[PDB]
Structure formats: structure tokens, C-alpha cells
Amino acid sequence: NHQWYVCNREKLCESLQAVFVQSYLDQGTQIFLNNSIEKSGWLFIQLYHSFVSSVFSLFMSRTSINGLLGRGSMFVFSPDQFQRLLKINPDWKTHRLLDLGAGDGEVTKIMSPHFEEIYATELSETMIWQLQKKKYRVLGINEWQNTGFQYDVISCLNLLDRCDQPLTLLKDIRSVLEPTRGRVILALVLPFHPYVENVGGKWEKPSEILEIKGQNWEEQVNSLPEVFRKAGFVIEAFTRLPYLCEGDMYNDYYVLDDAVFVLKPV
Ligand SMILES: Nc1ncnc2c1ncn2[C@@H]1O[C@H](CSCC[C@H](N)C(=O)O)[C@@H](O)[C@H]1O
């Protein structure tokens, strides 16, 4: 419970202590955990998924396998947590949303009711199927920057460390964000450990290095204002949320340490 959300606010720098928002384990988080515990109890389905995965991981990424089997869904924030972090009301709506590296869209649908048009990018073929099943407009990874129109909210959750050019991405996002009321939602697992996902436990180094240093969560968060400022952003709000993932035969679920930011352009 509290270990996922608590923060040593005294270790944060001046800028960050003002914009920090405290999050809590609400019912939306508890519904995902209970659903995850239920799914993980189905031994034979998990065994079948495990054996299919062990064969398909010889030529397929773990992400594409999860999208093929409809498994491994994840959780970043509840609708309530998303609204409290963005400082909006449940009825708030705007025009366009762009979710980069949206995966199977289970996190995207948390933000989806607040938008009229939803766009996504995704490298995995099977995940693209999941996004199209939700009727999102999927764009190429080098197509969303050159559409002509801008985006009110650009979401970039748990992608910077899985990306080959995170610095270019942050600047590409700034170029097509709506200047007046546009906002960026960004999530990162800390400690920052970047790698490009490939096939069968194979990873590569990113081409562009983000200078995210520190020996704990607060020190690494302190290193990010410079990174965000280099791309033309300032932190309007940020919080500490557990990055949750559905489980398997051995664990009911998995937890990672997410730092979630709301960025406004400057
Ligand atoms: N260059 C790229 N362009 C678009 N998607 C990418 C990408 N590189 C990796 N991805 C995708 O980004 C995802 C990272 S996992 C993040 C999934 C989801 N946004 C969440 O927070 O839960 C994977 O689905 C991966 O296939």
C-alpha cells in the first residue's frame, strides 16, 4: 500500500516540492489487483500461455506475444487518479489525444473518455490489432508528427526508456502539441534503465542517452527538470504511482516504480 505512493519530499529540489501531488490506492487500483489475482489463479490457461510464450519468444518479442494472447495488461492510474493529477473534473473533455507506444490500450482507455478523437502509435503488430479493436486511429511512428493538426494531450507512458531516440521524441512531441492548453502526460519507471526491446530476452542500447542519475526515486526525479526543460517543458504536476502488470503462474501481479508527470509547454 503506502510503500508504492510515499515520497521523501525533503529530498526533492525546490521546483519539484511545489508541484508534487500525493496519490493513494483507490478502488480503481484495487479492481485491477483483484482482477489480476483472479486471472492468475487459472493454472491451465497460464500454463498454455507460458508454453506458447516459450516457443514464440524464439522469433517474437514479449510485447507481441502478450498482444497475441491478450495477456499482460498493465495499470498506471485509475480514472480518478488521472483526473486528480491533471486537475480536471470527470466531465472534462477536449478534441484530440495522442498516446505514443499505447500497447494494448488498457491504459489508454483510462484517459479515453475525456477526448473526441484518439490517436496512437505502436511498434508491435499484435498490439496494433488491440488498438484498432478499440477503434483508435493508429498512426505510423514517423507519421504523427506530420499530420498537419496538433494534439491537445500527448500521452507518453513508460516509453522513453524503451525508445531508441528519447530526446528526439520529446522534441517531436513539443512540435505538435497545442500551445495554449496542451498538456503532456509522461510516465517513467525509476531507476531509469533504458533498453530497446527485441526478440527473446534480447535488448539494445538507445541511440540517445537521457541523463537521469540518482541512487533513489527522489534523486532521479531531481534530474528530470533539466531533461524536460531541454525539450521545452516544465512540470505542472507529478506523482508516484505503482506501475502494475497482470501476473502468471508464479505471481498474482507485478509492480514497478513509476514517476508520472504532467508537462506544459514553455
Ligand atoms: N518507437 C516506438 N514507437 C511507438 N511505440 C513503441 C516504440 N518503441 C516501443 N514501443 C512500444 O511502447 C510500449 C512500451 S510498454 C508501454 C505501454 C503502455 N504505454 C503503458 O504504459 O503501459 C511497447 O508496447 C512497445 O512495443
From Swiss-Prot:
It comes from the Eukaryota. S-adenosyl-L-homocysteine binds at E122, N158, Y243. Changing N158D: Abolished binding to S-adenosyl-L-homocysteine. Changing R162A: Decreased binding to SLC39A5 substrate. GO terms for biological process: methylation. It catalyses: L-histidyl-[protein] + S-adenosyl-L-methionine = N(pros)-methyl-L-histidyl-[protein] + S-adenosyl-L-homocysteine + H(+). Belongs to the METTL9 family. This is Protein-L-histidine N-pros-methyltransferase. It comes from Homo sapiens. The gene is METTL9.
